[PDB]
Amino acid sequence: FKLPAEFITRPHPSKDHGKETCTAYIHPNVLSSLEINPGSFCTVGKIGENGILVIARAGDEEVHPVNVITLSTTIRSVGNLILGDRLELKKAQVQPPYATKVTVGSLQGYNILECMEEKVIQKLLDDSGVIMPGMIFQNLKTKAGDESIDVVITDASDDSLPDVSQLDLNMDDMYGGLGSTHITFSKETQANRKYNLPEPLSYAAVGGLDKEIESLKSAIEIPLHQPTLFSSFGVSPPRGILLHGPPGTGKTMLLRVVANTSNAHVLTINGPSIVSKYLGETEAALRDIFNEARKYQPSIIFIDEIDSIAPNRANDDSGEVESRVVATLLTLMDGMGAAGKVVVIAATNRPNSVDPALRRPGRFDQEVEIGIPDVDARFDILTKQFSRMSSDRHVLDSEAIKYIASKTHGYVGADLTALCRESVMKTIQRGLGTDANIDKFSLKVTLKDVESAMVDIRPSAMREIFLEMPKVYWSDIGGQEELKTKMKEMIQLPLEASETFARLGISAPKGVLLYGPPGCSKTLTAKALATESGINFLAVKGPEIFNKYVGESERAIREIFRKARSAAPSIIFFDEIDALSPDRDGSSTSAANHVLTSLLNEIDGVEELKGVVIVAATNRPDEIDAALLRPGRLDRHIYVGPPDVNARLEILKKCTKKFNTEESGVDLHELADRTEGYSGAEVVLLCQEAGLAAIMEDLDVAKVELRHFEKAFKGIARGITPEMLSYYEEFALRS
Amino acid sequence: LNMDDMYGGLGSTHITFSKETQANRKYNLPEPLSYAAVGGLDKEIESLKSAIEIPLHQPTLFSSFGVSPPRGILLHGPPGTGKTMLLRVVANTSNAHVLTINGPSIVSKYLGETEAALRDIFNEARKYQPSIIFIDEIDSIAPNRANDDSGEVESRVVATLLTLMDGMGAAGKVVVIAATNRPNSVDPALRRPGRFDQEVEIGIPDVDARFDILTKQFSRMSSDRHVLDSEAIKYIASKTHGYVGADLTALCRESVMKTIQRGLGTDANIDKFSLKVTLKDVESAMVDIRPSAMREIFLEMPKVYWSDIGGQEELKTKMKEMIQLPLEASETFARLGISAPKGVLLYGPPGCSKTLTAKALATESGINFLAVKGPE
Numbered sequence A: 001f002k003l004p005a006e007f008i009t010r011p012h013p014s015k016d017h018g019k020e021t022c023t024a025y026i027h028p029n030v031l032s033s034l035e036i037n038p039g040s041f042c043t044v045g046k047i048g049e050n051g052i053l054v055i056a057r058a059g060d061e062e063v064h065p066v067n068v069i070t071l072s073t074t075i076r077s078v079g080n081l082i083l084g085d086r087l088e089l090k091k092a093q094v095q096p097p098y099a100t101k102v103t104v105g106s107l108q109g110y111n112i113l114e115c116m117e118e119k120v121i122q123k124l125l126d127d128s129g130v131i132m133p134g135m136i137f138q139n140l141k142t143k144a145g146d147e148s149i150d151v152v153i154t155d156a157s158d159d160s161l162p163d164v165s166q167l168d169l170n171m172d173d174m175y176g177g178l179g180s181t182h183i184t185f186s187k188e189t190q191a192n193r194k195y196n197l198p199e200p201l202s203y204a205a206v207g208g209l210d211k212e213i214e215s216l217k218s219a220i221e222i223p224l225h226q227p228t229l230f231s232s233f234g235v236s237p238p239r240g241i242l243l244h245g246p247p248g249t250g251k252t253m254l255l256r257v258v259a260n261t262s263n264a265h266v267l268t269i270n271g272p273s274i275v276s277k278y279l280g281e282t283e284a285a286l287r288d289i290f291n292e293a294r295k296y297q298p299s300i301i302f303i304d305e306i307d308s309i310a311p312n313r314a315n316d317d318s319g320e321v322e323s324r325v326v327a328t329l330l331t332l333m334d335g336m337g338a339a340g341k342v343v344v345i346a347a348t349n350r351p352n353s354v355d356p357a358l359r360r361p362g363r364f365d366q367e368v369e370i371g372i373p374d375v376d377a378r379f380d381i382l383t384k385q386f387s388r389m390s391s392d393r394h395v396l397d398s399e400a401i402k403y404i405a406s407k408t409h410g411y412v413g414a415d416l417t418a419l420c421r422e423s424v425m426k427t428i429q430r431g432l433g434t435d436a437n438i439d440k441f442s443l444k445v446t447l448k449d450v451e452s453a454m455v456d457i458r459p460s461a462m463r464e465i466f467l468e469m470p471k472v473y474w475s476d477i478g479g480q481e482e483l484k485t486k487m488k489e490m491i492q493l494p495l496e497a498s499e500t501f502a503r504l505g506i507s508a509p510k511g512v513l514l515y516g517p518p519g520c521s522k523t524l525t526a527k528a529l530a531t532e533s534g535i536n537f538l539a540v541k542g543p544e545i546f547n548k549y550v551g552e553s554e555r556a557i558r559e560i561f562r563k564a565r566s567a568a569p570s571i572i573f574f575d576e577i578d579a580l581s582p583d584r585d586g587s588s589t590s591a592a593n594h595v596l597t598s599l600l601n602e603i604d605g606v607e608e609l610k611g612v613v614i615v616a617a618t619n620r621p622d623e624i625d626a627a628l629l630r631p632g633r634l635d636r637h638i639y640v641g642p643p644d645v646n647a648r649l650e651i652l653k654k655c656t657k658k659f660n661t662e663e664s665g666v667d668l669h670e671l672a673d674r675t676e677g678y679s680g681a682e683v684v685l686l687c688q689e690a691g692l693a694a695i696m697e698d699l700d701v702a703k704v705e706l707r708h709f710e711k712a713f714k715g716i717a718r719g720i721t722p723e724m725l726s727y728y729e730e731f732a733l734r735s
Numbered sequence B: 001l002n003m004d005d006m007y008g009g010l011g012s013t014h015i016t017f018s019k020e021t022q023a024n025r026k027y028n029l030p031e032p033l034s035y036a037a038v039g040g041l042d043k044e045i046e047s048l049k050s051a052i053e054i055p056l057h058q059p060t061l062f063s064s065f066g067v068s069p070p071r072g073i074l075l076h077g078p079p080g081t082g083k084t085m086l087l088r089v090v091a092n093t094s095n096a097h098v099l100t101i102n103g104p105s106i107v108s109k110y111l112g113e114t115e116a117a118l119r120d121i122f123n124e125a126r127k128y129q130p131s132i133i134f135i136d137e138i139d140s141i142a143p144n145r146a147n148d149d150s151g152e153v154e155s156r157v158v159a160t161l162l163t164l165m166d167g168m169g170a171a172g173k174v175v176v177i178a179a180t181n182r183p184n185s186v187d188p189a190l191r192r193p194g195r196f197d198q199e200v201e202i203g204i205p206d207v208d209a210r211f212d213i214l215t216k217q218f219s220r221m222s223s224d225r226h227v228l229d230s231e232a233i234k235y236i237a238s239k240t241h242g243y244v245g246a247d248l249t250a251l252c253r254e255s256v257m258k259t260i261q262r263g264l265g266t267d268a269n270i271d272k273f274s275l276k277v278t279l280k281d282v283e284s285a286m287v288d289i290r291p292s293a294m295r296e297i298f299l300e301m302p303k304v305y306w307s308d309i310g311g312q313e314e315l316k317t318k319m320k321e322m323i324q325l326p327l328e329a330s331e332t333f334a335r336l337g338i339s340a341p342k343g344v345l346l347y348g349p350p351g352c353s354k355t356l357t358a359k360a361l362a363t364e365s366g367i368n369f370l371a372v373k374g375p376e
């Protein structure tokens, strides 16, 4: 009448020798309920992955609790059965036929074990059960020179009739004291890929965040491994650890890595399955989970999508899941014990959406920040991946890897993995289409398929962006170095002196304004800023945030600002802020005033945004509200007037570069001198319209004449009056 | 069904060898749709064939590297394009198991029932090695989280689907096909390179694709029921600049009804094959059906020849200028950097040849012309 439902694994205590393979400490009631002899085989369902790891069984001494079961570290490493998993029991399968060859692999060693061998076979098969594809044991004591050695035994050369058995366990009948089947030591084989064994996630698999992962590992290791030392201080160790970052950074991967690499008990939630219609069922389930958590001293708590599980109460008090669950989790994690050893890992995509009650120094003082990988991190990730599938399947030199990393500057580790997968599948498809069923080893991996892969896949942001790769560069634009010397320092201040700002307390005003006459270089200056910065750029313009619906503009503003906050320290730019700046003039609606107040509060009100930098562009800065025209925010003002002689000459030469200068008949200076009162846009359009005049004669031409240029000059107008220039100058004088 | 009786070892019932006709149509049995019906999407259908053949047929080659095979395939396009027909065709031609679902029928007021059904279906798919999963109307079942807080059925199903398709197995052979009307309404969580890195887009058919579809349809109903020439099909395809395959099928159907009713009215119940299908009924049907774009504003205004046009020669010269430059000067613009200003302003007194130039241009150019009335 016990009715056992789910079982939980546990390492075998006391070490020694004992069983070490078929402990299976289970209460005799469950043994009688299964109608199977205790001196026989047992199964662990572990949900799915058929094969069920048929291992022999043994009885306990009546104190071992029913729920918990022991699978030993050897089987735990063989099947990657991590702590806290659910298990099921069923009748054993047919007896194994026989074992044929069995071959050792000598994991992470240079082999040459004959000196320390000492008839390993007896040490390997001095145990009952023992599944041939998996044996992992401690080095114990082997002759002199201590050291540690491990063996890979995954490869096999036999087959079993049932397809259910994934690891095709074999029986043991050989001889040993304190000769085999044609020896067992041969070659340093790795994990067998034929059976597709689940490869454990190594601690070195993740990279590019070495400082962050080291800090996280130390912060979670010092409470568990040094509980008495921390309790001596009397301040008690916290249990909450916060993980956040942009999507695709692999936070779940590092959670899995730290769970696998830690021998302590680990617990994780399976998403919204805990949430149920019954009010008390969820509370009872959470209480039971916490009880099982602190019943054993070494325990790890993993929480995923805490934003969905614990949404902000102020943002939406829909009901059912509400602040009550936040309060009950806070009470549960506040007082499980005085010192204890418990750490809770919470991963959320949007920290702002999380309940601010969770984000408090009293409960979640320690935070871990993960950002977008840079060039070095992406290069390291690519090198790790190439080492992961080995040089036998691809050829890529270090310079090629660096070039690929530089080309894909806006990507992430998940993006790189998807790029590798798509490159592999496109290479396979090309080989199938062209080479007519050739061996895949000859074609391997090249550069053209990968280049086409990054061309086709496109960055995962799915938003329009110049990206600086296919757009205008610095050499294509000729301007004045006076503004360049200013902007380089201005945008190198935050990216390079964040620690200096933190130490000194001066911080950054984060306010820059650019005003220019119509037809001048203002959006050009913004593009130059974005190009030189080399950071993701959001193309936002004034009327874009405006919408017919009331309140939609505020929603769009909040969306773009929380996207910029999560898009690393960058620059946010407004193409035409003159649409919303004037409120007193023109009798602006209440929506414009609300948007202006919201942006005023966002720039330098109540909160400070250290990450993003606000740059604004206006067609006319004289009608702007006095609230925004305040020192501290958007204080810097640059005249950035029309291009001077050298800049105009460079622009003309760049436009004439497509043409031929020798046969053009111009010296590239007389045209600039004559076209001095025109705007930059008009100057650019002059070359195109003169080319049209030249090609008027017989369509495609190779010669341009002075009469065409004269007609082009006569047929166009500058459209700029001295009155607006005088007004713009008066704006500078008045400020 | 009827029982079998044979007199022999290792004479039938009055011979069995007679003709090589197709399946009997009197019973009107369903016919397994094949790739012959689909036409005009050769590149897209080949890409879909590759994407469905690479993981299922030879998963070991892809799994030997260790990067795991892709599991998510995304399909999207304008309504009525025929993507769901491609889904049914690949289901019929595939010998592997499929998991086509109804959609909202599974969704109920009980949150646990839907989760249990999802369990059962995905364990059924995973347990048997050859299995395919077909999911349609992705935007509904999984609305965008940022769009609205619908509640009940919400991003929880997105999370459980992601956890399901993340780790079904090491190599396996399992793919999921998602068909959505608009990719924008799809939850961005699904639209991820880790989940849906492969995207299949089936755009609106062009003139060649529409012509291929019409030819395939005519070959399907055979020449017994109609007499159409290649130039007639080409003209019909050219006239239908924006129609889709569903629109072409509707045009054929309405032409059939118009022909039937005209024959009944005039010929007084004449033989059906005598009148078959002509071109005048098709023209009347495409005129009366209204173009594919519902409530369109870029209308197809009529054309008129040059000798019916009267005006100054300077405007005609600028006309020829601005049409001859872009069509046959793209290489010149690319090499010279002139590009295309694409901006022309027409200002003048009302009622004197302001729109006459545009009308003559629509006539002469032959390119698909579109015009908008301003106040409309």
Ligand SMILES: Nc1ncnc2c1ncn2[C@@H]1O[C@H](COP(=O)(O)OP(=O)(O)OP(=O)(O)O)[C@@H](O)[C@H]1O
Binding pocket: A206, A207, A246, A247, A248, A249, A250, A251, A252, A253, A254, A381, A385, A412, A413, A414, A415, A417, B194
């Ligand atoms: N930096 C990286 N280096 C190598 N592989 C990576 C990297 N980032 C992601 N990947 C690959 O992409 C997969 C996705 O990682 P993971 O599931 O941890 O994503 P995540 O960013 O935590 O997001 P989500 O929770 O939505 O899955 C990894 O299992 C791995 O195969």
Ligand SMILES: Nc1ncnc2c1ncn2[C@@H]1O[C@H](COP(=O)(O)OP(=O)(O)OP(=O)(O)O)[C@@H](O)[C@H]1O
Binding pocket: B037, B038, B039, B040, B077, B078, B079, B080, B081, B082, B083, B084, B085, B086, B181, B213, B217, B244, B245, B246, B247, B249
């Ligand atoms: N290539 C084609 N050949 C013949 N008929 C076609 C073709 N493409 C589409 N059709 C027609 O279009 C219709 C199929 O519409 P279907 O529902 O499959 O489209 P869909 O683009 O998947 O959109 P929906 O979201 O409505 O399912 C049928 O009437 C079919 O005859």
Ligand SMILES: Nc1ncnc2c1ncn2[C@@H]1O[C@H](COP(=O)(O)OP(=O)(O)O)[C@@H](O)[C@H]1O
Binding pocket: A477, A478, A516, A517, A518, A519, A520, A521, A522, A523, A524, A576, A618, A619, A651, A680, A681, A684
């Ligand atoms: N040297 C150049 N080459 C190409 N395009 C240019 C050049 N200088 C300016 N432009 C274009 O002219 C535009 C300048 O806009 P601008 O007149 O400053 O806007 P506003 O009228 O609001 O001040 C930019 O969008 C840019 O694309």
Ligand SMILES: Nc1ncnc2c1ncn2[C@@H]1O[C@H](COP(=O)(O)OP(=O)(O)O)[C@@H](O)[C@H]1O
Binding pocket: B308, B309, B310, B349, B350, B351, B352, B353, B354, B355, B356
């Ligand atoms: N040769 C012609 N004979 C009869 N009608 C004509 C002829 N040429 C043009 N039209 C008519 O004159 C109209 C010209 O429109 P138009 O006056 O340019 O528009 P708008 O009133 O905007 O200036 C056309 O709608 C056309 O029907």
